[PDB]
Write a protein that binds this ligand. Structure first.
Ligand SMILES: [Ca+2]
Ligand SMILES: [Ca+2]
Ligand SMILES: [Ca+2]
Ligand SMILES: [Ca+2]
Ligand SMILES: [Zn+2]
Ligand SMILES: [Zn+2]
Lengths: 89, 89
């Protein structure tokens, strides 16, 4: 990671691995793991949607866990909301 | 204090604005602007695809520019690709 964009994606990968390496499959963020991720990494306006609501949305293949590709849904939705709020009067 | 995940998204937003503030509509990355972004922010396996190939692919509504939502398509594909490459070699 040499550029700002590459470092940012590398940080996103490290954030995901910080919760997927807790237990179970190394590429699975479970419902309780996601709850800690939301409470630790995300702002209140993302956090207050609830871990259960987010998990239903993120678990695309309905295997009971959130993989990295599914995790990008939360990442992108956080990016849209943060950028939207940055210009919002 | 801002979390690692929040900083990463702010950096992504900063990257986009770095090129959308160049000229014209300040929420628009034009063809040459996107080429500068790809040539500066992105690795080789992204760049080799071609700047014009990326533009045609990212400019979904064919309005002549890449807005923020369209730019996130590149971020997603780069995120998946970077994660896959981080588990190589
Ligand atoms: Ca796990
Ligand atoms: Ca899943
Ligand atoms: Ca512009
Ligand atoms: Ca467009
Ligand atoms: Zn903006
Ligand atoms: Zn991984």
């Amino acid at each position: 990671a040499l550029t700002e964009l590459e470092k940012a994606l590398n940080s996103i990968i490290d954030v995901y691995h910080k919760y997927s390496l807790i237990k179970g499959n190394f590429h699975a963020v479970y419902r309780d793991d996601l709850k800690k991720l939301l409470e630790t990494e995300c702002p209140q306006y993302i956090r207050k949607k609830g871990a259960d609501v987010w998990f239903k949305e993120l678990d695309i293949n309905t295997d009971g866990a959130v993989n990295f590709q599914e995790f990008l849904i939360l990442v992108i939705k956080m990016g849209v909301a943060a950028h939207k709020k940055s210009h919002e009067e």
